[PDB]
């Protein structure tokens, strides 16, 4: 009673990082190629506060998956890892909220 459709990626992105063009392209690209190892990933939604435009809420990103099958086998292997020096808290997200970027 948890699988929805899209994967969630928390505790692995700071607002001081999602503000640079180098850091951004580094996360979106890597996170993409990685997420595309357990199945198929439609897209990826990662906030990018414009000079601090979307800071009040920044810190949580994710990817739009195609099926919960691979989404499950993915998060089950992403939990307990480390983006750099902090344990990544992975979870599940509703495709609906994703579309509206409601972040729920």
């Amino acid at each position: 009673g948890h699988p929805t459709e899209v994967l969630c990626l928390m505790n692995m992105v700071l607002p001081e990082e999602l503000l640079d063009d180098e850091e951004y392209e580094e996360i979106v690209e890597d996170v993409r190629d990685e997420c595309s190892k357990y199945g198929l990933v439609k897209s990826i939604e990662i906030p990018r506060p414009v000079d601090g435009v979307e800071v009040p809420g920044c810190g949580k990103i994710f990817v739009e998956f195609t099926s919960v099958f691979d989404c499950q086998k993915a998060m089950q292997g992403l939990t307990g890892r480390k983006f750099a020096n902090r344990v990544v808290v992975t979870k599940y997200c509703d495709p609906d909220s994703y579309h509206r970027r409601d972040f729920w």
Partner: protein, 145 residues
């Protein structure tokens, strides 16, 4: 071919094998294994979610101060030199770097402690964490009516 061709830009998928973005052990050899799921269960609150997340970060932070597991520096390329916001009268000559790192770690943990205690009043902080204010005198006095 009929008329003209569009084709595709030549670019093979990179960022596959160069920099690990899903490690677990740093500063030392891989042997210390953290065993705790991060996924959050269906049927909680936004406050409790943080408490569950932060508890894991608190223990992992404490792990860091306990063994010295830092791994990568907070600022690899330092910005423009800037002093401290806190007023300090004087420091030790033997102790300063060590403490700066370890205390900073405690502050990371404490940041989460304060948050988790606010989110959950029943939360039990780690034993090494001490409540601020050393206080004066011995025990409590007696108010008379």
């Amino acid at each position: 071919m009929a008329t003209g061709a569009n084709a595709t830009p030549l670019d093979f998928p990179s960022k596959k094998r160069k920099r690990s973005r899903w490690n677990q052990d740093t500063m030392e050899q891989k042997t210390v294994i953290p065993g705790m799921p991060t996924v959050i269960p269906p049927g909680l609150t936004r406050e409790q979610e943080r408490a569950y997340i932060v508890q894991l970060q608190i223990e992992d932070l404490t792990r860091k101060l306990r063994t010295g597991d830092l791994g990568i520096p907070p600022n690899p390329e330092d910005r423009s030199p800037s002093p401290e916001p806190i007023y300090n009268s004087e420091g030790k000559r033997l102790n300063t770097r060590e403490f700066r790192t370890r205390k900073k770690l405690e502050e990371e943990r404490h940041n989460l402690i304060t948050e988790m205690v606010a989110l959950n009043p029943d939360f039990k902080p780690p034993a090494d964490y001490k409540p601020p204010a050393t206080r004066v005198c011995d025990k409590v006095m007696i108010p008379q009516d």
